[PDB]
Amino acid sequence: SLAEIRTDFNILYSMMKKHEEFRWMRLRIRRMADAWIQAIKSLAEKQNLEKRKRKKVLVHLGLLTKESGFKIAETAFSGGPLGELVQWSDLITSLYLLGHDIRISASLAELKEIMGGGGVELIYIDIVGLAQFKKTLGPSWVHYQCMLRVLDSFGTEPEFNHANYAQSKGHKTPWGKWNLNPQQFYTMFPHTPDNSFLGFVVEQHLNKRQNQSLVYGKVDSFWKNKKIYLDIIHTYMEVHATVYTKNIPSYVKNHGILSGRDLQFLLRETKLFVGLGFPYEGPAPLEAIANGCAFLNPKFNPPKSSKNTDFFIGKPTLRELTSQHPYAEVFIGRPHVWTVDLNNQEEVEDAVKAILNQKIEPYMPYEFTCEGMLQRINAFIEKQDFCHGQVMWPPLSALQVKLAEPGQSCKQVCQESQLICEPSFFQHLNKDKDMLKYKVTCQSSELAKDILVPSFDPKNKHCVFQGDLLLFSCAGAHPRHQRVCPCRDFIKGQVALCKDCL
């Protein structure tokens, strides 16, 4: 019953051959196999990985079911979306290497069969698959609720997750209203502290034409109305493309869709990877940076959200994007990432001229390496418990309380102290007695069911405490009062984990 690290992919390869729909994912795993095996052994030398119970794990890929009508496997090789497939590939690989008993499903039959057999201890699924899970199992689906880890790339804010509160605000999201512990949502980037950061691994194969730029956007429509911007870059640089077509100027050198090996070799010799503004928060820019390319990161002033961007309407968040790649912007920055308004011609020109004159190294944040990802997911599996069975994680010792000023969210105030909001600690900040510990003195108080509390008015020393524990929210600014915010430290380059969380 104890987990043994796997260093051989033969069983994973047989598992991935059962469905055609896993083909793209199988090629990625085979290209990164050596780096994966190097990282599980390396992690095992740094950390006792013994004494872990082997878990029976459901991995249900809703996006690859017919019934979903997503047809994501059918566009994998022709410029279709791959970020979800990137993340699913790396999640499956990590579970496999860490020695767990994985049962993969891309169908209602396998979902039913695997659950039928019992002993499932852990469930990875997407929101489309979660609807299927509830429908296939019936009312006893809720018995398995605390085991769900829900891969939700853009994240779910608590106001969208609480079904009744969401209705009361007129949130029509088809993605929300699941009433989970919002830490059960697993995001693509660490942009939503209400959720967990799952991420993925940035592919790279290193052991450069200074003039060569490569445009981000493997679909022609993404290039709509970028002619002036591309012209600026073309004044200094060749402009290449990987596009599967009358938006793409005449001077653009289109290589077509490249297989990962060949795309990775084009990144190796490219000086500048160029963002057009779409798509949002994908892997491709981190691949460019891992290959020593600068990334030109379109800045959004004002920031993009459901308030002003059609793509975001219906998504279970009000999160504002400051750039095409806010993670690249804030967690990498210069010299690797240049965040520029495509409007300000000077800004764009100076960025290109500087990029030409820079000498930069390949860079990967630790959390996006094989070993980083294995450490993050191993800590989640061993320590993250919503089934009340284990000791408190993260541990109470990690709690740092900060007061958010009016118009500042808990996300922002934790971040401004190089901490991260830790929603599992809201429970320790929610009554008169507890606030004394954190030098807030409540002259009066009341309860409220609001995402903005616990709140404190320092003028009349009045405390509002949370009436509905499902509405605890790192997201959200009080326009008038201070918020009492739970923060935590993180391991350097590993924001998912507190220093005492391993």
Ligand X SMILES: O=c1ccn([C@@H]2O[C@H](COP(=O)(O)OP(=O)(O)O)[C@@H](O)[C@H]2O)c(=O)[nH]1
Ligand Y SMILES: CC(=O)N[C@H]1[C@H](O[C@@H]2[C@@H](OC[C@H]3O[C@H](O)[C@@H](O)[C@@H](O[C@H]4O[C@H](CO)[C@@H](O)[C@H](O)[C@@H]4O)[C@@H]3O)O[C@H](CO)[C@@H](O)[C@@H]2O)O[C@H](CO)[C@@H](O)[C@@H]1O
For residue 283, how many C-alpha atoms fall within 13 Å in the half-sphere facing its CB?
Answer: 24
Choose the binding region for ligand X from 224-232, 257-265, 372-380, 394-402 (rule: CB under 6 A). 257-265
Residue 445 counted as an annotated binding residue: no
Q: Which of 182, 199, 275, 279 binds ligand X (CB under 6 A)?
A: 279
Residue type, 121: E
In angstroms, what CA-CA distances link 399 with 426, 498, 500? 10, 10, 11
The yes or no reply on residue 81 touching ligand Y (CB under 6 A) is yes
Assess 128 for contact with ligand Y (CB under 6 A).
yes
Examine residue 127 and tell whether it contacts ligand Y (CB under 6 A).
yes
325-343 b/e with 16+ CB inside 10 Å = b? bbbbbbbbeeebbbbbebe
- Which residue lies nearer to ligand Y by CB, 36 or 70? 70
**Residue 128 interacts with which of ligand X, ligand Y, none, CB < 5 to 8 Å by class:** ligand Y
- Parallel, antiparallel or unpaired: strands 482-488 and 455-457: antiparallel
**DSSP 3-state helix, strand, coil percentages of the chain (rounded to 5)?**
40, 20, 40
Task: Print the binding letters for residues 288-327 with ligand Y: x by CB under 6 A, - otherwise.
Answer: ---------------------------x------------
Site membership for ligand Y, residue 57 (CB under 6 A): no
Contact criterion met (CB below 8 Å) for 174 and 255? no
Q: 244 or 393, CB closer to ligand Y? A: 244
Instruction: Tell me if 315 is assigned to a ligand binding site.
Output: yes
Tell whether residue 175 is a contact of ligand Y (CB under 6 A): yes
- Binding-residue pattern over the window 81 to 110 for ligand X, x denoting contact by CB under 6 A: xxx--x------------------------
Tell whether residue 27 is a contact of ligand X (CB under 6 A).
no
Name, in order, each residue with C-beta under 8 angstroms of 132's C-beta and a sequence gap of 6 or more.
Answer: 60, 62, 65, 67, 68, 108, 111
Report how far Cα 39 is from the mean position of its chain's Cα atoms. 21
* Inter-residue contact 270 to 291 (CB < 8 Å): yes
Nearer to ligand Y, 181 or 375 (CB): 181
Q: What minimum distance in Å lies between the beta carbon of 229 and ligand X?
A: 18
Applying CB under 6 A, the site for ligand X has a residue count of: 15
Alpha-helical (H) ranges within 55-126 are: 83-97, 108-116
Among 49, 63, 252, 267, binds ligand Y (CB under 6 A): 63
CA distance 418 to 404: 14
Applying CB under 6 A, does 218 fall inside the site for ligand X? yes
**Cβ proximity of 43 and 371 under 8 Å:** yes
Q: Residue holding tokens 């999640």? A: 91
266 or 318: CB nearest ligand X:
266
Contact call for residue 284 and ligand X (CB under 6 A)? yes
Q: Report the DSSP beta bridge partners of residue 272.
A: 213, 294
Q: Judged by CB, which is closer to ligand X: 259, or 390?
A: 259
- What residues make contact with ligand Y under the rule CB under 6 A? 63, 69-70, 81, 84, 126-128, 152-154, 175, 315
Q: Give the residue ranges of the annotated binding site for UDP-N-acetyl-alpha-D-glucosamine.
A: 287
- What residues make contact with ligand X under the rule CB under 6 A? 81-83, 86, 218, 242, 257-258, 260, 263, 279, 282-284, 287
